[PDB]
Write a protein that binds this ligand. Structure first.
Ligand SMILES: CC(C)Cn1c(=O)n(C)c(=O)c2nc[nH]c21
Ligand SMILES: [Mg+2]
Ligand SMILES: [Zn+2]
Length: 311
């Protein structure tokens, strides 16, 4: 029953951020039920003052969260609701604990939270070609970042569904700006785009020319931040990361129409060196308080490498 789930969520009391541990970069969701993750998501919107600043009605926000959750496929090992929820939690932590909140506007924070939660909507698994083959054949080269555009379309449809319009409170101009930031935020989760633009971000930091005051770099930062949250499972405490790596490995090797372990340690070390280390280092420079993400990433590299050499 769906309306029953909505009834329960809407009537439930929302515990504090401290009680939910959502401010911790080390946050984990394994012990939480779907209902509990939904309550954590409400707390994120609430504490970031989005519910107040944009006059969201409780029942609407609840319905929206449940529609979002419902549109991820639980049969997919990694790209599912829990990943999206975790990505948003990391965004929340980076904003609060990481003190990034003060460097952005309310509309940017609103867009980021929604994007984090919506960035992988309807994902069918890295080894699934359905979404791509269901579009205009040579559709891969025309509308590039095909998956991300799909995720955004899904995000937008939910945002416009009756009873789910959490942005109805914004003015038309506020709305167009938010939608634009949300779209860019989601497109940014395409690693191909991350690898294409990260160089500029890194370059701007070396020369100490990074300036969030100019729109170009702010947009570049939001894109880098989204990626940082999207890959944050790589920064978790060793016992947690070991588990999240299992999920990634399952989707990569076992799923796609559904020894393995040995491939995992080297895969995670390669992933960290090639994609993660520089990003979290860069982020730490922008905000000293985001260090734990980097620290966590390093500790995990050490652990996986030790296994790679065989413990
Ligand atoms: C999921 C995949 C597309 C990218 N990706 C990721 O996000 N995390 C967290 C990993 O640990 C990982 N290992 C390989 N690829 C990975
Ligand atoms: Mg994605
Ligand atoms: Zn993702």
């Amino acid at each position: 029953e769906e309306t029953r789930e909505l009834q329960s969520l809407a009537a439930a009391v929302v515990p504090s951020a401290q009680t939910l541990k959502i401010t911790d970069f080390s946050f984990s969701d394994f012990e939480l039920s779907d209902l509990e993750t939904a309550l954590c998501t409400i707390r994120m919107f609430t504490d970031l003052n989005l519910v107040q600043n944009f006059q969201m009605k409780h029942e609407v926000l609840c319905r929206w969260i449940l529609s979002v959750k419902k549109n991820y496929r639980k049969n997919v090992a990694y790209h599912n609701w829990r990943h999206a929820f975790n990505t948003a939690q990391c965004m929340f932590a980076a904003l609060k604990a990481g003190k990034i909140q003060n460097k952005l506007t309310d509309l940017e924070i609103l867009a980021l939270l929604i994007a984090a939660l919506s960035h992988d909507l309807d994902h069918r698994g890295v080894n699934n070609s359905y979404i791509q083959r269901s579009e205009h054949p040579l559709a891969q080269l025309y509308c590039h970042s095909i998956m991300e555009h799909h995720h955004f379309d899904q995000c937008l449809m939910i945002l416009n569904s009756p009873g789910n319009q959490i942005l109805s409170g914004l003015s038309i101009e506020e709305y167009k700006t938010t939608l634009k930031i949300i779209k860019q935020a989601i497109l940014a989760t395409d690693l191909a785009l991350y690898i294409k633009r990260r160089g500029e971000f890194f370059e701007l930091i070396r020369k100490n020319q990074f300036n969030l005051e100019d729109p170009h770099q702010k947009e570049l930062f939001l894109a880098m931040l989204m990626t940082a949250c999207d890959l944050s499972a790589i920064t978790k405490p060793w016992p947690i990361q070991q588990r999240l790596a299992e999920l990634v490995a399952t989707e990569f090797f076992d799923q796609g129409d559904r020894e393995k372990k040995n491939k995992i340690p080297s895969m995670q070390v390669g992933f960290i060196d090639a994609i993660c280390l520089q990003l979290y280092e860069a982020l730490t420079h922008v905000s000293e308080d985001c260090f734990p993400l980097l620290d966590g990433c390093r500790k995990n590299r050490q652990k996986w490498q030790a296994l790679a050499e065989q413990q």
